[PDB]
């Protein structure tokens with residue numbers, strides 16, 4: 689019993705973290721086989737950042753402009769190239785701790801584990817959701833660029849996020865491991881806004897199932913609804929529409945608890961319309977939207 693934010697074990701990813709320095713900037717990189725990936729902004733000076741022409745900045749650099757350190761071992765840079773908003777540095781040593789891995793582009797609403805690193809050194813691990821507005825609500829400080837987000841399936845690490853920046857609102861923006869930003873952002877030091885966020889309805893419902901699996905039942909009722917009248921109320925409270933595909937995804941949880949999806953939906957409508965009246969669900973007064981159905985099943 690019990691239900692916690694739970695990250696994947698981070699060892700496989702820890703063995704890939706290195707330190708990358710260019711001039712006086714030090715930030716993290718990811719060392720897979722004979723390649724190190726890091727934010728290309730590592731090459732910018734204070735002035736360059738404002739309005740960088742990265743192709744111009746990079747052609748001016750050479751292999752010895754980059755220092756890569758793996759623990760206290762220097763790795764020799766023998767090649768460099770641009771990979772959208774990442775640099776790809778080729779090193780003379782293949783990482784012997786390279787796990788089975790792939791690069792995935794995470795979708796809105798999906799979760800991943802973040803390994804926050806400073807100076808090439810892992811510092812903490814936590815779960816985050818890709819927000820509908822293509823930001824993550826992380827916890828990152830200066831020096832954390834290059835920190836990665838990942839999931840694990842069996843043996844295989846699926847890297848999905850590399851951290852670039854914090855927006856003014858205090859949320860975070862970064863790239864996939866092909867170097868393409870999530871969302872409308874650019875790697876310039878200018879104020880950028882994200883779109884208006886919305887709540888991840890599928891995840892809220894999953895969490896409500898988790899609550900029931902853990903014995904929190906007060907918010908259940910016998911009121912029911914159709915998918916359409918649920919959606920009308922969702923829209924009013926800035927919740928994502930719920931689709932039949934989403935309903936289907938909740939099938940196993942629904943079968944496990946004996947609570948039909950639309951009946952839980954009726955439970956959520958009531959929670960949205962009248963609040964909680966001083967009570968908690970899994971210890972929270974907030975409707976939690978960063979556990980997916982999969983995170984619920986895997987844990988409960």
Ligand SMILES: *C(=O)[C@H](Cc1cnc[nH]1)NC[C@@H]1C[C@H]2CCCC[C@@H]2CN1C(=O)CCNc1ccccc1
Pocket residue numbers: 713715729732733734737828829830831832833834852853854874875876877
């Ligand atoms: C990187 O580690 C940091 C991540 C962070 C900070 N708080 C939470 N996460 N982001 C660095 C930040 C943003 C990027 C955006 C793209 C262009 C470069 C820009 C550099 N950033 C700075 O804060 C720069 C601060 N001054 C500075 C000047 C010269 C060289 C390095 C840094």
